[PDB]
Amino acid sequence: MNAPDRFELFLLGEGESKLKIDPDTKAPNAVVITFEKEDHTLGNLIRAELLNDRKVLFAAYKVEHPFFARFKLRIQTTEGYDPKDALKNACNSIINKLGALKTNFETEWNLQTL
């Protein structure tokens, strides 16, 4: 009766943007990115990939409410490292690893009989 339609878990709203980027307060070189219509599937992976960037200082995400499909990701890097570039390189590394995964699995499965 009061439940929201399930498509709101992945379907952006009227004026909802996918990413909302804001500068962090009382912190240098730190940024808060509100991901809209997302969940732990993306946030955990983005943070785990960001943590392997040796020039990335702080990186963590939180889901402020399980009702709402959205989360916040805070990133802080060294001076001269724009956080948006840190996020871009993380996403590209993710896509590279996933492509290699797909290639190797396809090789193994086509090798596999039955």
Binding site: N52, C91, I95, A100
Partner: protein, 264 residues
């Protein structure tokens, strides 16, 4: 082969594949199983219009059962979301229309399986919409039961969706998942009465890793990288395609992130 994540397949069948994931961090495998569950698209009945129902069941009862029916979705990429297409309600490029009519003519009880579903809409040459049938007797899954003199006549529109909107669009059944069978990483504290080792049973996956020696100190800096998975599919999409399409959908979500970053 390629530089990065490695896969070694222990066993493979039409219905499930047991394999090993190497050189991957945990978050990747967890997002992979999450996508395999919810983010990969299929096709299932999302509208039912009933003409006559003389059955012992209610209409929405049968409609829910119909939605749960596994339909073919191998060529689902060529199908479009009915919310994305431009037709009025549902076209041939965004939906698959099925018809189901059955009458109780025998004195004995009549069965309505899923094989009694007939596809009215034009497939346009795509391999979708066919009800999956693994019963050795060839009958579909049991949909309803009829007495002599009862009939059920309805039309089912099947659209494209993902599990998050409803669990009917579920490509997979149960994804097995285990890492570190020996608890070498001290990620869980075993509960016990006398002996943790004798009270807990050894996992099947203990064979594929060397046992730790009690004299060895705690290998502490080591992280989790080798996982044991077993992916099972209902039949809407073959297993290999379930995992591959999940990988692709994860790529697609990260790519949408990247394009949003570019357009910022």
């Amino acid at each position: 082969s390629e530089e990065g994540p490695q896969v070694k397949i222990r066993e493979a069948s039409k219905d499930n594949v047991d394999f090993i994931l190497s050189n991957v961090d945990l978050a990747m495998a967890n997002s992979l199983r999450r996508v395999m569950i919810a983010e990969i698209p299929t096709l299932a009945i999302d509208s039912v219009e009933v003409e006559t129902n003389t059955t012992v069941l209610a209409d929405e009862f049968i409609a829910h059962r119909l939605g749960l029916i596994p339909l073919q979705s191998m060529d689902i990429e060529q199908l479009e979301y009915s919310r994305d297409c431009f037709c009025e309600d549902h076209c041939d490029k965004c939906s698959v229309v099925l018809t189901l009519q059955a009458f109780g003519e025998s004195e004995s009880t009549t069965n309505v399986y899923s094989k009694d579903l007939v596809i009215v809409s034009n497939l346009m040459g795509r391999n979708i919409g066919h009800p999956i049938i693994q019963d050795k007797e060839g009958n579909g899954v049991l949909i309803c039961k009829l007495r002599k003199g009862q009939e059920l006549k309805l039309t089912c529109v099947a659209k494209k969706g993902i599990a998050k909107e409803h669990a009917k669009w579920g490509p997979a059944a149960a994804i097995e998942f285990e890492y570190d069978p020996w608890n070498k990483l001290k990620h869980t504290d075993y509960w016990y009465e006398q002996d943790s080792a004798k009270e807990w049973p050894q996992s099947k996956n203990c064979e594929y890793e060397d046992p730790p020696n009690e004299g060895d100190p705690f290998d502490y800096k080591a992280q989790a990288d080798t996982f044991y998975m077993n992916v099972e599919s209902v039949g809407s999409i073959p297993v290999d395609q379930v995992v591959v399409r999940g990988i692709d959908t994860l790529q697609k979500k990260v790519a949408s992130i990247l394009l949003a970053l570019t357009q910022m």
